[PDB]
Symmetry: C3
Subunit: 136 residues, 3 copies
């Protein structure tokens, strides 16, 4: 394990947060595991959508975005996925990160605090300047 | 660093071209350009035109992603998310919406229906092997 | 005077057929992934089904492969990728499988050879958290 290129990102624990900040499973992971921080159990009925808090807020540096993506095993095993995927967190969004889950499986599913519910991948984006034309 | 992208208004476009909300925004809001109101009933999938076509430079893609508010409040999201626009796609950008909520929802022209984030992609050269 | 590429090791599994995933043109962002199920698979309306592709890859560090929906399949049949965008990184060396869901109006048969998803390779960044009380 040698040198590594990182981007430093400010993050705040809110009152409902427990445990560690979002972690990369390994040194080779593209995404950090987001963890449910709802104080009381949340049931997602078949077909229903529920917003799940994470208890963290971040301030991304300019030109970097955080993508909220589905955790694959949850979709494969329970049909649980991220209803607004991929979620876009940019430097403007400094409120609590919340994961919008939908139950597209065949059984009701309970979200409990501590459950891994989504992945967060940080990447660069570009800024477009439009050049309007009548011929493409 | 800013990238210039050619954009064409088609006959059905209105208002200003897709805009970044602020200097820190990752994406531009895509706006519905349907001439008549479109109802997306529960479970239905509907293609919404935007009235624009773009010509991306090589190595750049535009990603069509859901707007958070429509999904949180109405279960409306982008059915083929994220949509991939690249330098080959020079036709009209259309947003494929699905209603996974519990109430019918009307798409009106002028409504913000998706986000467009431009990013770089890398071109893969495969190295075939029997041993990973 | 060249284009920029990233070289990625790829292994064909026994069920793979045809050429390695291809870019449609020199200007394409993604490669077409092809169904590699040996027998037809029916995806009933509302059902979710994992479709194998017959490949495994070894991405270099800080590169990911995104598994994204193929637009025509969603527009015409309501078939899309249920865990989209799928994230393949350097740790995943198993067979790539596409998780499809049928949100259309008709049961749909996935046949071997069908294009079922797009694969776009991009860089990601590694976050170092800086914890603070004021954002």
């Amino acid at each position: 394990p040698g040198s590594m290129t990182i981007i430093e990102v400010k993050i705040k624990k809110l009152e409902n947060f427990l445990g560690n900040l979002p972690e990369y499973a390994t040194e080779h992971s593209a995404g950090m595991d987001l963890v449910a921080a709802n104080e009381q159990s949340i049931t997602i009925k078949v077909g229903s959508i529920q917003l799940i808090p994470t208890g963290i807020a971040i301030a991304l540096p300019e030109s970097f975005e955080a993508q909220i993506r589905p955790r694959s095993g949850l979709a494969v095993k329970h049909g649980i996925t991220v209803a607004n995927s991929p979620g876009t967190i940019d430097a403007d969004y400094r409120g609590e990160i919340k994961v919008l889950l939908i139950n597209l499986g065949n059984k009701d599913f309970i979200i409990e605090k501590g459950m891994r519910i989504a992945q967060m991948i940080i990447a660069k984006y570009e800024r477009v300047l439009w050049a309007e034309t009548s011929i493409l």
